[PDB]
Design a binder for these strands. Structure first.
Length: 49
RNA sequence: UUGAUGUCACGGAACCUUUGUUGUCUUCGACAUGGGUA
């Protein structure tokens, strides 16, 4: 038993997004991935392009 | 397209340094033209 709460966020400013990286590099040892953890994330449909 | 008992990323000024500068009197006299004649 759960209740779903529809959430929308309206940005009043340009928001920051983090650069895409390989799933091999999405760990605490990669500085760039950790530094961008508070930003938005880009999703790739396919890893190649 | 996240994972969860732990995110100061509003935690970080694209910032700092380079002269569109230099040189020149709005001045002034000899031609122009191609043959023609035998």
């Amino acid at each position: 038993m759960t209740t779903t709460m529809k959430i929308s966020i309206e940005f009043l400013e340009p928001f920051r997004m983090t650069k895409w990286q390989e799933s091999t590099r999405r760990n605490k040892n990669n500085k760039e991935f950790v530094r961008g953890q508070a930003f938005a994330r880009w999703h790739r449909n396919k890893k190649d392009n």
